[PDB]
């Protein structure tokens, strides 16, 4: 077993002048592969509005990656400020969470 | 631009599928089988006497060891005596059913995969005083050759009838270059040092053993033919067969060679055959044992 | 020796039909059955349909009907027998018809039966999808400034794959990952692709994110650094 | 190493013997194949003809037997010769030499091989012009500085056969220096103006003087500019 | 002869246009107007001394693959007619050319003007002729007008220019003469040089007083 480095990218200017931000969580260099990763909006669960995808297992590291996304309206992401994802797995004794609380 | 040419290109009409309308055709014949009636306008070799029969595409012809059987009622004895040259008594004898398995391959003053001799080299011959007889020579050790076609070729295929075509030669995608082989020469100059030396048991030993290359005939009996690939090539030997012997690397001899594609094996009245050209550069590689 | 070339790869719009060719060579043709499979993403194989040479006669799936049909090419030359063309045309396309076609062969038997397949074509990926070729875009992604730390690319809404990402042009390959493309947005695919580097060189060096996409001649260039 | 530099007179008269000479020097002539390329304006390039060091005489079968090459190893001069020259042959001279080398492709001593040039030093050129019409002299008069970095000029006027060289300080001044197109009178002529770039603190102080040079009329000028309150 | 173009710094690609036959050594030349040809591509593959190593031929070529020059990143002083010289063993002694492609590199800076100004020289004002004299250069691009009033009037006789054309420094430029007399300068007040760029104009002003 190992740990997966958690990571939240913030939504970006970049792509909030086009009206749909992509709020990215990213673990790197885990295994089991299967995960429960889940994530909130102004501390409150969504669905419907996700991209998840695996990765497969390294010739040279036997690890994996994930990333899913988070794509919203432009009203939606400021309307709201803190921002968290979830991870949970076999290998973890405590859930884990990071911020980017938006504005701050 | 002249330099020493070998193809010629030709036209002629032939039938489409309705038997009745003419098209033009045209291919590459060597200038070998190709003469002159009188811009200009020639014809094949031999429309007087012969009907020239094409060798169908479906067959091969390549040496594949043929075992000669008696049988039930016959036997067969085999020699194993390392000094027979040829007659008198055999003082040991087994036998056999069946011979070994000899590969027949039909060429002309050199002995191609033949077998080998056990000690040292063999000469052979039936009455060795008598001019008109023949001298088999037969080596201990392999002496090998490396031929080829350089040049690239494709196929037409022109039609005759229904159901029958007809292979000529259409295009050289590349370079016009000559065939030729190679006999190495520090081998060939050291086999030559062992039927010299037993030449001079038969002779004497005092005596100054000359090689000479030819004086006349046709193509199939002046130089060394093949049955290679699916062609027929006729190469200039007289290269291997000059030097003198006075009784005391990798530099190979190279050997120009012809090609023809309308051949007349064993001279029958009024008969030709005809092969088809071989898409593709051809290879060979080929032991040298025994001279005749 | 016994070749199945398949051809090839396509991309229509629905409603559309699609004919695939099958050429074989180094066997007699006449002799022997050859049957058409398929491979979905996500149900696993699917058998299509069976043709016997000689003669033409087809049978199909029951799930298949008045959709798929094929049919073959013999080669009529007395002085070669062992080559042949076989077809099939599937008509009646929609997006969930997306998948990977195979033109399988069986091997010389005693004691077997007919769907045991030896000889495999490399097969050709049929793609139906309503979008039309359109470029991709770039946006960065770092962090704000000891600990390493994800720099990377975001190449979202592209149409059709595959795009070729590369590092600095390109030497930067170590600690690079990428994922495979998310699915589709409205008909649209991305790609994310993350380098990880420890965090002193964030504030050192500019990095490059080579965008490559060939069917639109598409390349664009983001540098990333940290904000 | 090899040093080109060609001659041959402006204008010449149609239908008479053309003579362009080539001033070699090195000496080092005799390692290698001369020839002349010429170019036709309007058009690409074409050859003329070989000589070699043992004097094989070959030229291009589109001209006509019309052209001959000589060489000479004492003076170390080449030179080239069309005769009955129409105008047809209006282009410009370039002298070259070649080297030689072989692509094989097959085998050495069955003749399976062939030959291909390339050419290392280039010339200067020299044009020449046919018509029936004769050399002019010019009428050269220097053009006088303004105050400002300051405009040195010089004016050659009904001038042809063309093109004009023209320098300063006797030749020694190349700081500043260069020439336009000669331009195109409607008396068949040719004006060339002059520009040089020289500071006004220096050039109310030397001995400017508009060098030309003109070997088609056969005339050399030096006449000194003056001031002006421009 | 045949055009080429491609911006600064964009690898160019010119083909022969010699469908060659068996094997071959081909040559490409720099023809750079102005000046004399230049041997840069020496038997498919090298380079000599004096050419940069900008140009490569292609030298890692088996049989049948067309021969291409490749110019990785062009100079402003690239501009040139680009010949390929190709023999073969299928023909004869070959002594033909064949084109050839000119590299007419685009995205190149800046038209900038000048007038260079000239007197009435007083040498030849007693021969009744007069010097005025504009030279003119410093663009890109170099279709550029001159033009000569009389205070408001525009007058055509008596001017003599060429087309324009390159100098060394990658600009271009433009020339005149003009046969006046001084019965044609007194006659108005002053003369004025004009020169006209892309639709802006330079006027410069001269006199009989004032040059
Ligand atoms: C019977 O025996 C006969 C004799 O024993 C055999 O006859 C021989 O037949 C072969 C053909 O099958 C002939 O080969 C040809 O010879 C050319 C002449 O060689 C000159 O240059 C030699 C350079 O030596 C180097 O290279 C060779 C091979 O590459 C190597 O063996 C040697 O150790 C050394 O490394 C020099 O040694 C010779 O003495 C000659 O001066 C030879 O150049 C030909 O190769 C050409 O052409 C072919 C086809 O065009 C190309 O595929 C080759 O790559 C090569 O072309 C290269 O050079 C060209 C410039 O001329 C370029 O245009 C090409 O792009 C290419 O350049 C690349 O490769 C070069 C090699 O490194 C580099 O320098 C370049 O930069 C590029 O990388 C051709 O092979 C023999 O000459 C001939 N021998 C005799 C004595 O005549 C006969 O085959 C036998 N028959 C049978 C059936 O066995
Ligand atoms: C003396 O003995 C030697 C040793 O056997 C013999 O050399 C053999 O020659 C045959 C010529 O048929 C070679 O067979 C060919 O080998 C090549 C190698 O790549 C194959 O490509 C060939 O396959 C083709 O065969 C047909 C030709 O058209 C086609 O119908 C077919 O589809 C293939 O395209 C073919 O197998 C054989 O390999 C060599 N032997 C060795 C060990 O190399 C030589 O011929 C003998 N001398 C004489 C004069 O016969
Ligand atoms: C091949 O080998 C055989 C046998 O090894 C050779 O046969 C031998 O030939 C010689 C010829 O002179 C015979 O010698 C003669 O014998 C008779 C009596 O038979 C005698 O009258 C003569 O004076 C002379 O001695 C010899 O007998 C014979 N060998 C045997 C075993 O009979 C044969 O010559 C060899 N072939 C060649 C071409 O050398
Ligand atoms: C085609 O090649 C042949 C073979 O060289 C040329 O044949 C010549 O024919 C004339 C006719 O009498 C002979 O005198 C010559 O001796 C032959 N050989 C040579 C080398 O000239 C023939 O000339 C060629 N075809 C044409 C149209 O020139
Ligand atoms: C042999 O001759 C034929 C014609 O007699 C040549 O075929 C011609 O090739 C040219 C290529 O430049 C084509 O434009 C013509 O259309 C061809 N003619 C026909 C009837 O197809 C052929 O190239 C010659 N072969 C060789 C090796 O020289
Ligand atoms: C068919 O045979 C005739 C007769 O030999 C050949 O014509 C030539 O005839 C004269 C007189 O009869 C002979 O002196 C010549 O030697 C003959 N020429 C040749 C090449 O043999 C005719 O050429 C022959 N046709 C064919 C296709 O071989
Ligand atoms: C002889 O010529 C044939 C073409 O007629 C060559 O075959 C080609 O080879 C190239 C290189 O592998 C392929 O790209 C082509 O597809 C081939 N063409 C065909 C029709 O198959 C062959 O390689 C040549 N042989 C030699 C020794 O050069
Ligand atoms: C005939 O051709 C064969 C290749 O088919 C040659 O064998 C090669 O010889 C060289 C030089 O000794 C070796 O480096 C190679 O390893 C040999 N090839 C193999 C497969 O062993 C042979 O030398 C040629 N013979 C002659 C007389 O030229
Ligand atoms: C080898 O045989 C050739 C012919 O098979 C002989 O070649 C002749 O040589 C003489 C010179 O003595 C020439 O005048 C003839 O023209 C040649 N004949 C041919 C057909 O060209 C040769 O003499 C023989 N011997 C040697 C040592 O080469
Ligand atoms: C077989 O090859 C020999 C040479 O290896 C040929 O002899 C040459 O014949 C020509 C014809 O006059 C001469 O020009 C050459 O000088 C000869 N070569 C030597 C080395 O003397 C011989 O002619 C060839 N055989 C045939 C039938 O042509
Ligand atoms: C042609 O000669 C070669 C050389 O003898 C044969 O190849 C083998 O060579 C090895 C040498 O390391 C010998 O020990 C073998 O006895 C040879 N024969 C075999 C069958 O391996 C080659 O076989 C010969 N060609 C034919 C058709 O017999
Ligand atoms: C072969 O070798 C012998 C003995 O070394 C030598 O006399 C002879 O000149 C060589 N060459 C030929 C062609 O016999
Ligand atoms: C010839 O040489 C052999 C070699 O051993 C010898 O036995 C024989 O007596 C010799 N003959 C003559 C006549 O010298
Ligand atoms: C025949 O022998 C002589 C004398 O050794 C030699 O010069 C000549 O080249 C040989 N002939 C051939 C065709 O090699
Ligand atoms: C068909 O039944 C026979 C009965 O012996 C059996 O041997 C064979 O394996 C069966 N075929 C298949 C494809 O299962």
């Known amino acids: 077993v190992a740990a997966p480095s958690v990571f939240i990218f913030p939504p970006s200017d970049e792509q909030l002048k086009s009206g749909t931000a992509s709020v990215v969580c990213l673990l790197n260099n885990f295994y089991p592969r299967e995960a429960k990763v889940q994530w909130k909006v102004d501390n409150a669960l969504q669905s419907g509005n996700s991209q998840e995808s695996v990765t497969e297992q390294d010739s040279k590291d036997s690890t994996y990656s994930l990333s899913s996304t988070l794509t919203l309206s432009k009203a939606d992401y400021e309307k709201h400020k803190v921002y968290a994802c979830e991870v949970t797995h076999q290998g973890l004794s405590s859930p884990v969470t990071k911020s980017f609380n938006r504005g701050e | 631009a002249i330099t020493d040419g070998e193809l010629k290109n030709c036209s002629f009409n032939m039938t489409t599928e309705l038997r009745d309308k003419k098209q033009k055709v045209y291919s590459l014949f060597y200038r070998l089988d190709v003469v002159q009636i009188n811009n200009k306008e020639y014809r094949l070799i031999n429309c007087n006497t012969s009907a020239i029969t094409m060798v169908c595409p479906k067959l091969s012809f390549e040496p594949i060891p043929i075992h000669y059987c008696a049988p039930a009622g016959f036997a067969i004895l085999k020699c194993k005596d390392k000094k027979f040259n040829g007659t008198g008594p055999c003082p040991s004898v087994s036998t056999v059913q069946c011979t070994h398995g000899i590969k027949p391959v039909l060429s002309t003053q050199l002995l191609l995969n033949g077998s080998l001799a056990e000690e040292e080299v063999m000469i052979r011959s039936e009455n060795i005083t008598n001019n008109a007889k023949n001298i088999l020579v037969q080596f201990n050790t392999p002496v090998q050759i490396n031929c080829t076609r350089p040049l690239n070729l494709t196929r037409k295929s022109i039609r005759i009838g229904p159901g029958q075509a007809f292979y000529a030669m259409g295009d050289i995608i590349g370079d016009i270059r000559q065939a030729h082989c190679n006999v190495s020469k520090a081998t060939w100059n050291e086999t030559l040092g062992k039927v010299v030396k037993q030449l001079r048991k038969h002779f004497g030993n005092n005596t100054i053993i000359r090689f000479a290359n030819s004086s006349g005939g046709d193509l199939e009996v002046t130089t060394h033919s093949f049955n290679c690939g699916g062609e027929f090539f006729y190469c200039n030997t007289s290269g291997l067969f000059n030097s003198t012997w006075i009784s005391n690397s990798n530099d190979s001899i190279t050997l120009p060679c012809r090609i023809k594609m309308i051949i007349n094996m064993w001279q029958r009245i009024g008969q030709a055959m005809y092969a088809p050209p071989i898409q593709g550069v051809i290879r060979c590689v080929s032991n040298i044992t025994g001279l005749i | 020796q016994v070749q199945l070339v398949q051809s090839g790869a396509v991309i229509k719009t629905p409603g559309s039909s699609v004919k695939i060719s099958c050429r074989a060579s180094g066997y007699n043709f006449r002799d022997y059955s050859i049957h058409w499979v398929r491979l979905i993403p996500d149900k696993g194989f699917e058998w299509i349909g069976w043709i016997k040479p000689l003669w033409g006669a087809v049978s199909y799936a029951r799930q298949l009907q008045g959709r798929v049909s094929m049919t073959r090419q013999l080669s009529q030359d007395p002085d070669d027998p062992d080559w042949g063309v076989a077809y099939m045309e599937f008509s009646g396309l929609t997006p969930a018809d997306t998948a990977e076609y195979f033109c399988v062969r069986r091997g010389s038997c005693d004691y077997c039966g007919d769907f045991p397949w030896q000889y495999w074509c490399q097969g050709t990926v049929v793609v139906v999808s309503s979008a039309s070729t359109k470029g991709p875009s770039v946006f960065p992604l770092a962090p704000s400034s000891g600990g390493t730390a994800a720099l990377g690319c975001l190449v979202k809404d592209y149409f059709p794959e595959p795009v070729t990402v590369s590092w600095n042009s390109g030497a930067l390959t170590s600690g690079v990952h990428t994922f495979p493309a998310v699915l589709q947005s409205s008909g649209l695919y991305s790609l994310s692709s993350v380098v990880t580097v420890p965090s002193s060189s964030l504030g050192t060096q500019t990095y490059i994110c080579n965008v490559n996409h060939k069917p639109s001649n598409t390349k664009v260039d983001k540098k990333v650094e940290p904000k | 190493q090899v040093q080109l530099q060609e001659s041959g007179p402006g204008l010449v008269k149609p239908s008479e013997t053309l003579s362009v000479t080539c001033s070699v020097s090195g000496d080092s002539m005799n390692n290698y194949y001369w020839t002349w390329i010429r170019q036709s304006p309007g058009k690409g390039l074409e050859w003329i003809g070989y000589i070699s060091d043992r004097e094989s005489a070959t030229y291009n079968p589109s001209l006509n037997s019309r052209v001959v090459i000589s060489r000479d190893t004492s003076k170390n001069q080449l030179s080239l010769k069309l005769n009955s020259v129409t105008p047809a042959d209006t282009a410009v001279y370039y002298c070259?030499?070649?080297?030689?080398?072989?692509?094989?492709?097959?085998?050495?001593?069955?003749?399976?091989?062939?030959?291909?040039?390339?050419?290392?030093?280039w010339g200067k050129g020299t044009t020449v012009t046919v018509s029936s019409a004769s050399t002019k002299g010019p009428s050269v008069f220097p053009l006088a500085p303004s105050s400002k970095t300051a405009a040195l000029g010089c004016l050659v006027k009904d001038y042809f056969p063309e093109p004009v060289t023209v320098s300063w300080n006797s030749g020694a001044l190349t700081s500043g220096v260069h020439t336009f197109p000669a331009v195109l009178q409607s008396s068949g002529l040719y004006s060339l103006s002059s520009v040089v770039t020289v500071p006004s603190s220096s050039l109310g102080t030397q001995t400017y003087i508009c060098n030309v040079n003109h070997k088609p009329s056969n005339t050399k000028v030096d006449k000194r500019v003056e001031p002006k309150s421009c | 002869v045949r055009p080429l173009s491609v911006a600064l710094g964009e690898t160019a690609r010119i083909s022969c246009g010699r469908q060659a036959l068996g094997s071959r050594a081909v040559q490409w030349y720099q023809h750079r107007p102005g000046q004399a040809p230049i041997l840069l591509i020496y038997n498919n593959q090298d380079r000599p001394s004096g050419i940069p190593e900008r140009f490569s031929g292609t030298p890692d070529i088996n049989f049948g693959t067309r021969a291409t020059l490749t110019i990785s990143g062009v100079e402003a002083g690239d501009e040139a007619d680009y010949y390929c010289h190709m023999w073969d063993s299928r023909s004869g002694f070959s002594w033909s050319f064949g084109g050839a492609t000119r590299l007419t590199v685009l995205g190149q800076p800046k038209a900038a003007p000048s007038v260079t100004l000239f007197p009435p020289s007083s040498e030849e004002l007693q021969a009744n002729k007069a010097t005025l004299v504009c030279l003119i250069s410093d663009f890109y691009p170099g279709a550029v007008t001159v033009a000569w009033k009389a205070d408001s009037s525009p007058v055509k006789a008596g001017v003599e220019t060429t087309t324009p054309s390159k100098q060394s420094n990658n600009k271009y430029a433009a020339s005149s003469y003009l046969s006046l007399t001084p019965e044609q300068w007194k006659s108005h007040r002053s003369y004025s040089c004009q020169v006209t760029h892309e639709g802006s104009t330079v006027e410069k002003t001269v006199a009989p007083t004032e040059c």
């Open positions: 070259a030499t070649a080297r030689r080398g072989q692509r094989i492709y097959g085998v050495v001593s069955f003749g399976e091989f062939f030959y291909y040039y390339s050419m290392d030093v």
